[model samples]
Every structure is written in structure tokens, then in C-alpha cells.
Target: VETENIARGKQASQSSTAYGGAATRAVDGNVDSDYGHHSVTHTNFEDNAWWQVDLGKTENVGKVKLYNRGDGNVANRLSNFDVVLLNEAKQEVARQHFDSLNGKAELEVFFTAKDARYVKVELKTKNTPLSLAEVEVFRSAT
Candidate 1:
């Protein structure tokens, strides 16, 4: 069987929503970077603004991919961030930091393998607007 996108259409959350882009939009399986299309998640300028997806249950996560905003310089807004995995108890299981941004549209954070229920992407810089065109979670096949 092929690996599936576990986060597709799953419940998503963010620190706050701005510009009518709710957290749910990012996980709706749409990778539209243009916020005008209503397929992105945007958070207000704040410290540690984040976007998360709940897998509904503990599942072995292999990797995650983030689709950056492709319409504007918004990719610059997501320069400093970290992708973390958490268990049902909300304890940190693994972490991946991204600092050197090259204005790309897609970023892949590999986890090798781990069991986690909640996966989150958080902006580390202060007062930064967090935006995500899409967040995809997947697991490898045995």
C-alpha cells in the first residue's frame, strides 16, 4: 500500500487566525499559497505563533512537508521556525529546526520514524506572522 497523507482533512489549530485564513484550511489538502484563495493558515503577529495538526490517534510519523506561500514575499515571514512532534500527553517527542530559508515553496522535515499524535510548526522569532500554505504528514510503508 502507498503511504497516505495522514493530515489531510484532519483537525488543525493555530495560535490565531488572521485574514479569514483559519487553521483548518492548511490541512484541507489544498496547497494554494495565495491567501486570496482561502487555502492557507495565517496567524497574527505574535511570539511563538504556531500551526498544528492532530492525527486523531498515535501513528508512526515518518516525515512532514510544508508548502510555503508562493504568491508573495511571505516565504520570508517563515524564516525561523521549528517542527515538533508530541505524544498524547503533549510531551515533546522529536524536533526539527529550520533557519536558513532560501525562499522556496516546499520544505520537507524528515523524522525517520516516530509515534506522535500531534505535530506542530512554530515560529521562533518574536512578533512574526505565521503562515502555511499547507501541512502534510505521512508515514512510510513497511
Candidate 2:
């Protein structure tokens, strides 16, 4: 199947924000993969910290690419998060857990094609804050 990145330049929102780490950064098409800037962070490393993007329309999603912090030991901070795909009705279509990447700069998750309008990356529990430089969603077409 052919695929296209659907999250770029899309409308994004987060559960909360701090230090100008808004959710829009994830979809800004900046893939610097830094911990300082070009990343989105929620307030206080709270539980359920999330950043979501609306694809504008239902899409047959097949893959998701996340640019995590490459500087410092921050990559592990993204562990135990869930990449959830939701339909226009806000019902979950598919979800995959990111356990650990051990300081890798990027993580990619692949799944069966599912119809989704929203893609969310959320912290499974507290302590690990949500920090992502980019979230690239791809929809497949046969």
C-alpha cells in the first residue's frame, strides 16, 4: 500500500503545556530531534500527558513515526506511552505501546490499516513527561 504523512501541518492540541512547549510543535514539520526546542512538553510530567493531532478527515492509517529527544538521556523518558488512533467519533481504533527505545532519536510503529481522524500519543503513567519533536502519521492506500 502507498502511504502519505497526514500529520504535517495539521491541527494539534495537548493536555497541557509549559515553557512554550505547545502541541503544535509536533506537527510543525520540524524534525530537529532536540530536547531544547522543536519539541512539545506537557506540564509537570503529569499522568495521561498527551499530544494529539486531527488528520482533518478519516484516513486509513498504517504507520506512525515519532521523533523523540535525541539530546541527553531523554529518549527513555518517552517509554510506556501509547500511540492511539481514534475515529472521527473519538472511539479508539488501534493502540500500541512504546516500551523503550534506549535513547533512540526516532521510533516508528506499524499496524493494520484502520480508519482514524485523530492520533494521540499519551503517557501511560506519571513521571515520564511527554516530549516529542515530531509525530508523523501515515495513511495507506492500496
Candidate 3:
């Protein structure tokens, strides 16, 4: 298990803005649903829609928790996305593609601990846009 939430209050960014939602909502430490009020929404139904979080420094990331939009039937909107980890040089260290998600509340993705400075979630092939309620990154307990 990881020791702490290293992504809390970190800098976040998205490809676009939808429903007036900001990327910071994913790292705001709030997962409450308010119709995109407490989430990050990307504009349009594009395959390249993405949301990224900067950890401020390179750390050993082992797990990532993604909170999908919990307002209504938007679980599929978050499905079929890819989570990518990048090092300080913007090199891809690891990536995982999720084809199906069990629930909208949270989806836990585990990976081997690797040093990363940026974590990005990209909407691959989805009919809906990118809307994430929260993103949590944890460092491995070494």
C-alpha cells in the first residue's frame, strides 16, 4: 500500500473545458457530485481529451484512483480511457488502458512503482466527453 496522497492539491490541467468545469476539481480533495460543479469536464466528444496532474516532483507512484462523474449515467463516459505516467523528461514510463469500469464512484488501477512527475488520464475512444470527479495518486511505501 502507498503511504500518502501525493497528488493532493497538485496542479491539474485538461484538454478542454466543458460545463464550466475546471481541471482543478479533480485534485480539490472533493468528490461530491453537483452536476459537474465538483468535477472536471472536457469539451466535446473527442478521442484525445485528456486530464493531467503534476506531482511537483518525481516520486515513486504505485497506484492511481480515479473518480468518475457520479451525477447520473455517466459511467460509460469515463470508460475506455488510458492512464499514463511520465517522468521529468516527459517520457512515458508506464500506461494502462481501462476498457471497462465496475462503478462510477471509484476505479483503482495498480501498477509497478515507477518514478513519475506527471500523471495523465486520456479519453481514448468514448462517445462521451471527459469528466472526472477526482484523481488520487499514491506513492509506494518504501
Candidate 4:
């Protein structure tokens, strides 16, 4: 089995109602929780190009938990998401993509030798207005 459990991403405190499971807000910095979980309060994602996450360390990744925050459902949850694993030298070692990021499903890319030192969770959009509450990266061992 290729599965490593890691703590959830830090974001707002609101909960998710996606039906399949619980999806907490994926906000990063200080923001209000009145609008929605993955919603940015004042700042607009106008021409928002991308966002990333540094895993803090390097390790092999088996699974990734992406919080759609209600954007996607059981069938089509995540709109667009990709993982670029970087080694300690800040170089792209591996990359993966999910066309229709749907639901709370675990995308078992089962990638190996992924240096978690700097894992970037890039979110892309074609003027469709996409937001992510939190991006969870899981590993098996040190």
C-alpha cells in the first residue's frame, strides 16, 4: 500500500459540506470565514496565476489529499491541481496532474524518490475562478 498520513493543512476553521466527507477551509493566512472555506475575503483572485506548498522536507509521496472546499463533488471535485516534487536543490524531480480534480478521493500517483523538501501544489485556472482550502501531502517514512 502506498499511503503516508500527514497532518492537515492550516487554514480557516470553518467546516465543509461536500457530502462525502469533511472539508475544512484551505485558507493560508489571516482571513474571515464569513464567505466560504476556500473563499478569499477581500482580495480577488483576478488573474490569479498559481499557488504552491513547501513540504518542509524531502521524502517519497504516496498519496495527496486535496480539499476542494465544495468546488468539486463526488464526480468532479477538484477543478485543476498538480504536484511538482522538488529535491533539496530546488529542482523539479517529479510532476503529476489531475485534469478534473473531483471529490475527496486520494489520487494515488504512487510517485517514488520524491524529495519533500519543497513540494509545490500548483493550482491553475482558465478564468474559471478556482480556490483551494488546503493541500495535504502524505508520506510513508523518513
Question: Which candidate has the highest TM-score of all?
Answer: 1
Per-residue lDDT for 50-103 in model 2, tens only?
889999999888889998867766677788889999999999999998787666
lDDT of 3 by residue, 114-134 (tens): 899999998887455788888
Off by over 4 Å in 3: none
User: What is the C-alpha local distance difference test score of candidate 3?
Assistant: 0.82
Q: Estimate each model's TM-score.
A: 0.95, 0.91, 0.91, 0.56
* Candidate with more favorable, higher TM-score: 3 or 4: 3
Better of 1 and 2 by TM-score: 1
Mark the regions of model 4 whose C-alpha exceeds 4 Å error after superposition.
Answer: 1-48, 71-77, 103-109
lDDT of 1 at 30: 91
Give all candidate RMSDs, comma-separated: 1.4, 1.6, 1.7, 7.7
lDDT, candidate 1, 76-105, per-residue tens: 888889999999998999999999459778
TM-score of predicted structure 4: 0.56
Off by over 4 Å in 2: 1-3, 39-42
Q: What Cα-based lDDT does every candidate model obtain?
A: 0.88, 0.81, 0.82, 0.46
Q: Give the top-scoring candidate (lDDT).
A: 1
Error (Å) of candidate 1 at residue 138 is: 0.4
Model 3 TM-score on a 0 to 1 scale: 0.91
